Amino acid sequence: MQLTDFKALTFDCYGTLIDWETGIVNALQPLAKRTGKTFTSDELLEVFGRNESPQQTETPGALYQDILRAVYDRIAKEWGLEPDAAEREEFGTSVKNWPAFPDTVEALQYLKKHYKLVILSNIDRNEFKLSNAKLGVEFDHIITAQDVGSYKPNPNNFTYMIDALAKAGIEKKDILHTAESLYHDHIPANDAGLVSAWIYRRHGKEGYGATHVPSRMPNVDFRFNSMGEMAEAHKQALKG
Ligand SMILES: NCC[C@@H](O)C(=O)O
Ligand SMILES: [Mg+2]
């Protein structure tokens, strides 16, 4: 099993390609100021992570800004605060400001020479365009939660993706699903019969950050600590 066996990379975006943690910590600062407490980054991230997937179950057809607005309301409620409409809007429209990780553009541009690059992300189409402008590549296919009518880890998100790629001549065996999230991505990839590459962005940190806790450790086929490290691996695999 090696990287060159695959024709397509299918990606998790937020937490793998885009550094959503930096974005969420920054966007929660005004709400946090109202509590009087200094929170650590992990505290902010974990209250997000206990709330985002429940919200996506609650409103599975919501656009992502509406998810984020409702997550703001959930966090405010854990903190004993009444929501403030303008603060909620500033949080919920913050994806425009969530940066790429510093290795992402270079890695994606390299990998685009060798694979079809696909997005399977908990996002809506228009919102994703904002992030795509920070990623430096044309994606061959983009599958969003909006397209499916639900969010990962719903199995239908993976079936939709697999089907779309089959119609473009990419068999399931051709796909390498590339993602940080054990909960959103590699557990349902296991169940869907996909090969997995774990991009362990938090390898040097505690817990899962903004990502929901996974119910088990899925079985992954590759692990890289960053996207640059995946690209460097491919440059040697290609010589074989
Ligand atoms: N890392 C969790 C979120 C991600 O899977 C995405 O849908 O972009
Ligand atoms: Mg509710």
PDB file of C-alpha atoms and ligand atoms in Angstrom:
ATOM      1  CA  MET A   1       0.000   0.000   0.000  1.00  0.00           C
ATOM      2  CA  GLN A   2       1.655   3.286  -0.996  1.00  0.00           C
ATOM      3  CA  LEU A   3       0.689   6.812  -1.870  1.00  0.00           C
ATOM      4  CA  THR A   4       1.158   6.270  -5.615  1.00  0.00           C
ATOM      5  CA  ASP A   5      -1.611   3.625  -5.629  1.00  0.00           C
ATOM      6  CA  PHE A   6      -4.256   6.349  -5.578  1.00  0.00           C
ATOM      7  CA  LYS A   7      -5.650   8.666  -8.283  1.00  0.00           C
ATOM      8  CA  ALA A   8      -7.514  11.100  -6.052  1.00  0.00           C
ATOM      9  CA  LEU A   9      -7.065  12.707  -2.643  1.00  0.00           C
ATOM     10  CA  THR A  10     -10.309  13.546  -0.903  1.00  0.00           C
ATOM     11  CA  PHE A  11      -9.866  16.162   1.826  1.00  0.00           C
ATOM     12  CA  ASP A  12     -11.257  17.323   5.116  1.00  0.00           C
ATOM     13  CA  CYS A  13     -10.725  21.114   5.018  1.00  0.00           C
ATOM     14  CA  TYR A  14     -11.264  22.781   8.383  1.00  0.00           C
ATOM     15  CA  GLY A  15      -8.491  21.536  10.699  1.00  0.00           C
ATOM     16  CA  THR A  16      -6.449  19.927   7.898  1.00  0.00           C
ATOM     17  CA  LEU A  17      -6.016  22.553   5.135  1.00  0.00           C
ATOM     18  CA  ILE A  18      -7.509  25.616   6.844  1.00  0.00           C
ATOM     19  CA  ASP A  19      -6.411  26.325  10.432  1.00  0.00           C
ATOM     20  CA  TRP A  20      -9.918  26.629  11.869  1.00  0.00           C
ATOM     21  CA  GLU A  21      -8.550  26.518  15.438  1.00  0.00           C
ATOM     22  CA  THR A  22      -6.701  29.792  15.060  1.00  0.00           C
ATOM     23  CA  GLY A  23      -9.838  31.200  13.466  1.00  0.00           C
ATOM     24  CA  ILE A  24     -12.229  30.015  16.224  1.00  0.00           C
ATOM     25  CA  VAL A  25      -9.990  31.130  19.095  1.00  0.00           C
ATOM     26  CA  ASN A  26      -9.709  34.576  17.544  1.00  0.00           C
ATOM     27  CA  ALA A  27     -13.452  34.822  16.806  1.00  0.00           C
ATOM     28  CA  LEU A  28     -14.444  33.821  20.360  1.00  0.00           C
ATOM     29  CA  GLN A  29     -12.426  36.623  22.036  1.00  0.00           C
ATOM     30  CA  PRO A  30     -15.252  39.201  22.363  1.00  0.00           C
ATOM     31  CA  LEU A  31     -17.705  36.675  23.851  1.00  0.00           C
ATOM     32  CA  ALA A  32     -14.992  35.412  26.186  1.00  0.00           C
ATOM     33  CA  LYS A  33     -14.213  38.978  27.324  1.00  0.00           C
ATOM     34  CA  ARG A  34     -17.814  39.217  28.618  1.00  0.00           C
ATOM     35  CA  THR A  35     -17.259  36.330  31.030  1.00  0.00           C
ATOM     36  CA  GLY A  36     -14.483  38.038  32.946  1.00  0.00           C
ATOM     37  CA  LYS A  37     -12.317  34.864  32.612  1.00  0.00           C
ATOM     38  CA  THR A  38      -9.168  34.284  30.602  1.00  0.00           C
ATOM     39  CA  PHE A  39      -9.652  31.064  28.658  1.00  0.00           C
ATOM     40  CA  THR A  40      -6.864  28.957  27.192  1.00  0.00           C
ATOM     41  CA  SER A  41      -7.022  28.121  23.512  1.00  0.00           C
ATOM     42  CA  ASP A  42      -7.869  24.500  24.316  1.00  0.00           C
ATOM     43  CA  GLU A  43     -10.730  25.535  26.603  1.00  0.00           C
ATOM     44  CA  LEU A  44     -12.243  27.671  23.816  1.00  0.00           C
ATOM     45  CA  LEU A  45     -11.714  24.952  21.247  1.00  0.00           C
ATOM     46  CA  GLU A  46     -13.163  22.167  23.404  1.00  0.00           C
ATOM     47  CA  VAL A  47     -16.409  24.014  24.185  1.00  0.00           C
ATOM     48  CA  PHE A  48     -16.717  24.476  20.375  1.00  0.00           C
ATOM     49  CA  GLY A  49     -15.928  20.826  19.891  1.00  0.00           C
ATOM     50  CA  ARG A  50     -18.604  19.659  22.351  1.00  0.00           C
ATOM     51  CA  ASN A  51     -21.185  21.780  20.479  1.00  0.00           C
ATOM     52  CA  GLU A  52     -20.532  21.884  16.726  1.00  0.00           C
ATOM     53  CA  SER A  53     -21.450  18.320  15.788  1.00  0.00           C
ATOM     54  CA  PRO A  54     -24.588  18.362  17.978  1.00  0.00           C
ATOM     55  CA  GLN A  55     -25.600  21.564  16.175  1.00  0.00           C
ATOM     56  CA  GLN A  56     -25.008  19.939  12.781  1.00  0.00           C
ATOM     57  CA  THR A  57     -27.326  17.110  13.879  1.00  0.00           C
ATOM     58  CA  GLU A  58     -29.890  19.646  15.127  1.00  0.00           C
ATOM     59  CA  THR A  59     -29.975  21.612  11.863  1.00  0.00           C
ATOM     60  CA  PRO A  60     -28.488  19.301   9.214  1.00  0.00           C
ATOM     61  CA  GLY A  61     -29.522  21.451   6.264  1.00  0.00           C
ATOM     62  CA  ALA A  62     -28.231  24.730   7.742  1.00  0.00           C
ATOM     63  CA  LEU A  63     -25.656  26.799   5.909  1.00  0.00           C
ATOM     64  CA  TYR A  64     -22.392  26.942   7.779  1.00  0.00           C
ATOM     65  CA  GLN A  65     -22.786  30.523   8.987  1.00  0.00           C
ATOM     66  CA  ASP A  66     -26.057  29.402  10.591  1.00  0.00           C
ATOM     67  CA  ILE A  67     -24.216  26.497  12.260  1.00  0.00           C
ATOM     68  CA  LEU A  68     -21.663  28.927  13.594  1.00  0.00           C
ATOM     69  CA  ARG A  69     -24.284  31.423  14.797  1.00  0.00           C
ATOM     70  CA  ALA A  70     -26.022  28.610  16.667  1.00  0.00           C
ATOM     71  CA  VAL A  71     -22.691  27.367  18.119  1.00  0.00           C
ATOM     72  CA  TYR A  72     -22.101  30.891  19.395  1.00  0.00           C
ATOM     73  CA  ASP A  73     -25.502  30.694  21.107  1.00  0.00           C
ATOM     74  CA  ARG A  74     -24.575  27.310  22.624  1.00  0.00           C
ATOM     75  CA  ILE A  75     -21.258  28.620  23.960  1.00  0.00           C
ATOM     76  CA  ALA A  76     -22.846  31.755  25.322  1.00  0.00           C
ATOM     77  CA  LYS A  77     -25.352  29.560  27.174  1.00  0.00           C
ATOM     78  CA  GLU A  78     -22.580  27.428  28.761  1.00  0.00           C
ATOM     79  CA  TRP A  79     -21.047  30.721  29.930  1.00  0.00           C
ATOM     80  CA  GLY A  80     -24.277  32.230  31.345  1.00  0.00           C
ATOM     81  CA  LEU A  81     -24.417  35.031  28.761  1.00  0.00           C
ATOM     82  CA  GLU A  82     -27.324  36.258  26.653  1.00  0.00           C
ATOM     83  CA  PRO A  83     -26.447  36.249  22.980  1.00  0.00           C
ATOM     84  CA  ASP A  84     -25.619  39.639  21.441  1.00  0.00           C
ATOM     85  CA  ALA A  85     -26.788  39.789  17.821  1.00  0.00           C
ATOM     86  CA  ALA A  86     -23.863  41.779  16.469  1.00  0.00           C
ATOM     87  CA  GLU A  87     -21.317  39.638  18.302  1.00  0.00           C
ATOM     88  CA  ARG A  88     -23.066  36.516  17.005  1.00  0.00           C
ATOM     89  CA  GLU A  89     -22.833  37.844  13.444  1.00  0.00           C
ATOM     90  CA  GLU A  90     -19.129  38.664  13.827  1.00  0.00           C
ATOM     91  CA  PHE A  91     -18.488  35.095  15.033  1.00  0.00           C
ATOM     92  CA  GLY A  92     -20.688  33.447  12.521  1.00  0.00           C
ATOM     93  CA  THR A  93     -19.239  35.226   9.511  1.00  0.00           C
ATOM     94  CA  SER A  94     -15.610  34.624  10.565  1.00  0.00           C
ATOM     95  CA  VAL A  95     -14.657  31.873   8.076  1.00  0.00           C
ATOM     96  CA  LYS A  96     -13.482  34.688   5.733  1.00  0.00           C
ATOM     97  CA  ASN A  97     -10.643  35.188   8.253  1.00  0.00           C
ATOM     98  CA  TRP A  98      -9.684  31.548   8.995  1.00  0.00           C
ATOM     99  CA  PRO A  99      -6.155  31.167   7.551  1.00  0.00           C
ATOM    100  CA  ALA A 100      -4.512  28.336   5.711  1.00  0.00           C
ATOM    101  CA  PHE A 101      -1.848  26.443   7.646  1.00  0.00           C
ATOM    102  CA  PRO A 102       1.558  27.701   6.464  1.00  0.00           C
ATOM    103  CA  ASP A 103       2.369  24.477   4.603  1.00  0.00           C
ATOM    104  CA  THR A 104      -0.979  24.006   2.891  1.00  0.00           C
ATOM    105  CA  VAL A 105      -0.736  25.970  -0.357  1.00  0.00           C
ATOM    106  CA  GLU A 106       2.668  24.605  -1.285  1.00  0.00           C
ATOM    107  CA  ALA A 107       1.631  21.063  -0.459  1.00  0.00           C
ATOM    108  CA  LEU A 108      -1.656  21.289  -2.373  1.00  0.00           C
ATOM    109  CA  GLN A 109      -0.009  22.831  -5.428  1.00  0.00           C
ATOM    110  CA  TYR A 110       2.487  19.966  -5.467  1.00  0.00           C
ATOM    111  CA  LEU A 111      -0.111  17.261  -4.931  1.00  0.00           C
ATOM    112  CA  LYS A 112      -2.326  18.766  -7.682  1.00  0.00           C
ATOM    113  CA  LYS A 113       0.346  17.723 -10.195  1.00  0.00           C
ATOM    114  CA  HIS A 114      -0.132  14.066  -9.237  1.00  0.00           C
ATOM    115  CA  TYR A 115      -3.722  13.576  -8.064  1.00  0.00           C
ATOM    116  CA  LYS A 116      -7.233  14.724  -8.647  1.00  0.00           C
ATOM    117  CA  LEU A 117      -7.910  16.869  -5.554  1.00  0.00           C
ATOM    118  CA  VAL A 118     -11.372  16.713  -4.002  1.00  0.00           C
ATOM    119  CA  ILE A 119     -13.039  18.449  -1.047  1.00  0.00           C
ATOM    120  CA  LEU A 120     -15.530  16.688   1.216  1.00  0.00           C
ATOM    121  CA  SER A 121     -16.237  19.316   3.841  1.00  0.00           C
ATOM    122  CA  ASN A 122     -18.640  20.468   6.538  1.00  0.00           C
ATOM    123  CA  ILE A 123     -19.311  23.777   4.814  1.00  0.00           C
ATOM    124  CA  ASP A 124     -21.650  25.242   2.183  1.00  0.00           C
ATOM    125  CA  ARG A 125     -20.632  26.046  -1.387  1.00  0.00           C
ATOM    126  CA  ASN A 126     -20.436  29.809  -1.198  1.00  0.00           C
ATOM    127  CA  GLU A 127     -18.655  29.855   2.147  1.00  0.00           C
ATOM    128  CA  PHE A 128     -16.105  27.323   0.899  1.00  0.00           C
ATOM    129  CA  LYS A 129     -15.208  29.656  -2.004  1.00  0.00           C
ATOM    130  CA  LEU A 130     -13.753  32.050   0.587  1.00  0.00           C
ATOM    131  CA  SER A 131     -11.469  29.355   1.904  1.00  0.00           C
ATOM    132  CA  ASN A 132     -10.636  28.046  -1.572  1.00  0.00           C
ATOM    133  CA  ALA A 133      -9.158  31.490  -2.409  1.00  0.00           C
ATOM    134  CA  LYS A 134      -6.632  30.833   0.392  1.00  0.00           C
ATOM    135  CA  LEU A 135      -5.733  27.296  -0.814  1.00  0.00           C
ATOM    136  CA  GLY A 136      -4.043  28.049  -4.159  1.00  0.00           C
ATOM    137  CA  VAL A 137      -5.537  25.305  -6.274  1.00  0.00           C
ATOM    138  CA  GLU A 138      -8.519  24.395  -8.395  1.00  0.00           C
ATOM    139  CA  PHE A 139     -10.236  21.386  -6.832  1.00  0.00           C
ATOM    140  CA  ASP A 140     -11.385  18.774  -9.317  1.00  0.00           C
ATOM    141  CA  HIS A 141     -14.553  18.128  -7.284  1.00  0.00           C
ATOM    142  CA  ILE A 142     -16.098  19.871  -4.302  1.00  0.00           C
ATOM    143  CA  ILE A 143     -18.671  18.069  -2.121  1.00  0.00           C
ATOM    144  CA  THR A 144     -20.104  20.185   0.646  1.00  0.00           C
ATOM    145  CA  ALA A 145     -22.598  19.494   3.440  1.00  0.00           C
ATOM    146  CA  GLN A 146     -24.960  21.771   1.497  1.00  0.00           C
ATOM    147  CA  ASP A 147     -24.803  19.408  -1.478  1.00  0.00           C
ATOM    148  CA  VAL A 148     -25.589  16.363   0.648  1.00  0.00           C
ATOM    149  CA  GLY A 149     -28.180  17.799   3.071  1.00  0.00           C
ATOM    150  CA  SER A 150     -26.235  16.627   6.159  1.00  0.00           C
ATOM    151  CA  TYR A 151     -22.831  16.959   7.796  1.00  0.00           C
ATOM    152  CA  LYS A 152     -20.089  14.392   8.354  1.00  0.00           C
ATOM    153  CA  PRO A 153     -19.950  11.900   9.985  1.00  0.00           C
ATOM    154  CA  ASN A 154     -23.260  11.039   8.332  1.00  0.00           C
ATOM    155  CA  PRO A 155     -22.504   8.081   5.998  1.00  0.00           C
ATOM    156  CA  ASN A 156     -24.474   9.749   3.175  1.00  0.00           C
ATOM    157  CA  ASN A 157     -21.740  12.400   2.914  1.00  0.00           C
ATOM    158  CA  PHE A 158     -19.231   9.691   2.020  1.00  0.00           C
ATOM    159  CA  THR A 159     -21.599   7.837  -0.346  1.00  0.00           C
ATOM    160  CA  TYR A 160     -22.278  11.089  -2.180  1.00  0.00           C
ATOM    161  CA  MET A 161     -18.548  11.698  -2.621  1.00  0.00           C
ATOM    162  CA  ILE A 162     -17.780   8.158  -3.708  1.00  0.00           C
ATOM    163  CA  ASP A 163     -20.581   8.243  -6.260  1.00  0.00           C
ATOM    164  CA  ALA A 164     -19.492  11.600  -7.678  1.00  0.00           C
ATOM    165  CA  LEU A 165     -15.957  10.351  -8.178  1.00  0.00           C
ATOM    166  CA  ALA A 166     -17.132   7.103  -9.752  1.00  0.00           C
ATOM    167  CA  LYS A 167     -18.992   9.156 -12.328  1.00  0.00           C
ATOM    168  CA  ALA A 168     -15.688  10.956 -13.075  1.00  0.00           C
ATOM    169  CA  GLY A 169     -13.902   7.610 -13.653  1.00  0.00           C
ATOM    170  CA  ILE A 170     -12.377   7.313 -10.148  1.00  0.00           C
ATOM    171  CA  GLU A 171     -13.102   3.926  -8.587  1.00  0.00           C
ATOM    172  CA  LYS A 172     -13.301   3.667  -4.769  1.00  0.00           C
ATOM    173  CA  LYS A 173      -9.992   1.749  -4.536  1.00  0.00           C
ATOM    174  CA  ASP A 174      -8.503   5.003  -6.321  1.00  0.00           C
ATOM    175  CA  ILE A 175      -9.358   7.300  -3.421  1.00  0.00           C
ATOM    176  CA  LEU A 176      -7.156   8.279  -0.456  1.00  0.00           C
ATOM    177  CA  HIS A 177      -9.267  10.103   2.116  1.00  0.00           C
ATOM    178  CA  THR A 178      -6.978  12.649   3.758  1.00  0.00           C
ATOM    179  CA  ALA A 179      -8.042  14.286   6.970  1.00  0.00           C
ATOM    180  CA  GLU A 180      -7.250  15.223  10.575  1.00  0.00           C
ATOM    181  CA  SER A 181     -10.588  14.228  12.016  1.00  0.00           C
ATOM    182  CA  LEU A 182     -10.919  10.776  13.523  1.00  0.00           C
ATOM    183  CA  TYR A 183     -14.586  11.525  14.338  1.00  0.00           C
ATOM    184  CA  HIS A 184     -15.754  13.257  11.151  1.00  0.00           C
ATOM    185  CA  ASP A 185     -13.613  11.452   8.631  1.00  0.00           C
ATOM    186  CA  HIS A 186     -11.696   8.297   9.492  1.00  0.00           C
ATOM    187  CA  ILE A 187     -14.427   6.445  11.430  1.00  0.00           C
ATOM    188  CA  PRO A 188     -16.909   6.875   8.570  1.00  0.00           C
ATOM    189  CA  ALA A 189     -14.136   6.237   6.010  1.00  0.00           C
ATOM    190  CA  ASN A 190     -13.509   2.906   7.668  1.00  0.00           C
ATOM    191  CA  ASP A 191     -17.237   2.113   7.481  1.00  0.00           C
ATOM    192  CA  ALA A 192     -17.282   3.202   3.819  1.00  0.00           C
ATOM    193  CA  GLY A 193     -14.382   0.984   2.824  1.00  0.00           C
ATOM    194  CA  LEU A 194     -12.015   3.831   1.981  1.00  0.00           C
ATOM    195  CA  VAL A 195      -8.232   4.013   2.463  1.00  0.00           C
ATOM    196  CA  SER A 196      -7.253   6.756   4.957  1.00  0.00           C
ATOM    197  CA  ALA A 197      -4.408   9.193   5.513  1.00  0.00           C
ATOM    198  CA  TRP A 198      -4.376  10.809   8.931  1.00  0.00           C
ATOM    199  CA  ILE A 199      -2.961  14.327   8.941  1.00  0.00           C
ATOM    200  CA  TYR A 200      -2.333  14.742  12.659  1.00  0.00           C
ATOM    201  CA  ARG A 201      -2.194  18.531  12.875  1.00  0.00           C
ATOM    202  CA  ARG A 202      -2.477  18.421  16.693  1.00  0.00           C
ATOM    203  CA  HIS A 203       0.292  15.766  17.051  1.00  0.00           C
ATOM    204  CA  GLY A 204       2.213  18.026  19.424  1.00  0.00           C
ATOM    205  CA  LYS A 205      -0.872  19.225  21.469  1.00  0.00           C
ATOM    206  CA  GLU A 206      -3.474  17.949  23.951  1.00  0.00           C
ATOM    207  CA  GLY A 207      -6.817  16.419  22.926  1.00  0.00           C
ATOM    208  CA  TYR A 208      -8.889  17.094  19.871  1.00  0.00           C
ATOM    209  CA  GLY A 209      -9.238  20.892  19.892  1.00  0.00           C
ATOM    210  CA  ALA A 210     -12.189  22.066  17.856  1.00  0.00           C
ATOM    211  CA  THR A 211     -12.859  18.528  16.629  1.00  0.00           C
ATOM    212  CA  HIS A 212     -15.469  16.377  18.374  1.00  0.00           C
ATOM    213  CA  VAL A 213     -14.045  13.516  20.467  1.00  0.00           C
ATOM    214  CA  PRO A 214     -14.110  10.256  18.476  1.00  0.00           C
ATOM    215  CA  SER A 215     -15.939   7.224  19.831  1.00  0.00           C
ATOM    216  CA  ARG A 216     -13.081   4.871  18.940  1.00  0.00           C
ATOM    217  CA  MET A 217      -9.662   4.873  17.176  1.00  0.00           C
ATOM    218  CA  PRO A 218     -10.342   4.073  13.537  1.00  0.00           C
ATOM    219  CA  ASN A 219      -7.849   2.203  11.352  1.00  0.00           C
ATOM    220  CA  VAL A 220      -5.726   4.491   9.270  1.00  0.00           C
ATOM    221  CA  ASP A 221      -3.440   3.517   6.398  1.00  0.00           C
ATOM    222  CA  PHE A 222      -0.958   6.425   6.579  1.00  0.00           C
ATOM    223  CA  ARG A 223      -0.086   9.088   9.132  1.00  0.00           C
ATOM    224  CA  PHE A 224       1.646  12.389   8.438  1.00  0.00           C
ATOM    225  CA  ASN A 225       2.099  15.207  10.919  1.00  0.00           C
ATOM    226  CA  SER A 226       1.465  17.884   8.289  1.00  0.00           C
ATOM    227  CA  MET A 227       0.552  18.371   4.637  1.00  0.00           C
ATOM    228  CA  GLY A 228       4.117  19.271   3.774  1.00  0.00           C
ATOM    229  CA  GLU A 229       5.240  15.974   5.207  1.00  0.00           C
ATOM    230  CA  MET A 230       2.694  14.133   3.005  1.00  0.00           C
ATOM    231  CA  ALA A 231       4.052  15.971  -0.060  1.00  0.00           C
ATOM    232  CA  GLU A 232       7.665  15.116   0.873  1.00  0.00           C
ATOM    233  CA  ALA A 233       6.641  11.479   1.270  1.00  0.00           C
ATOM    234  CA  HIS A 234       5.047  11.478  -2.162  1.00  0.00           C
ATOM    235  CA  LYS A 235       8.180  12.956  -3.785  1.00  0.00           C
ATOM    236  CA  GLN A 236      10.113   9.826  -2.667  1.00  0.00           C
ATOM    237  CA  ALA A 237       7.240   7.386  -3.338  1.00  0.00           C
ATOM    238  CA  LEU A 238       7.072   8.664  -6.961  1.00  0.00           C
ATOM    239  CA  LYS A 239      10.682   7.516  -7.537  1.00  0.00           C
ATOM    240  CA  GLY A 240       9.845   3.869  -6.897  1.00  0.00           C
TER     241      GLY A 240
HETATM  242  N1  LIG B   1     -11.735  18.558  10.803  1.00  0.00           N
HETATM  243  C1  LIG B   1     -13.225  18.515  10.959  1.00  0.00           C
HETATM  244  C2  LIG B   1     -13.951  19.260   9.826  1.00  0.00           C
HETATM  245  C3  LIG B   1     -13.564  18.730   8.476  1.00  0.00           C
HETATM  246  O1  LIG B   1     -13.808  17.325   8.372  1.00  0.00           O
HETATM  247  C4  LIG B   1     -14.322  19.401   7.330  1.00  0.00           C
HETATM  248  O2  LIG B   1     -15.448  18.954   7.087  1.00  0.00           O
HETATM  249  O3  LIG B   1     -13.769  20.346   6.696  1.00  0.00           O
HETATM  250 MG    MG B   2     -31.067  24.452  20.003  1.00  0.00          MG
END
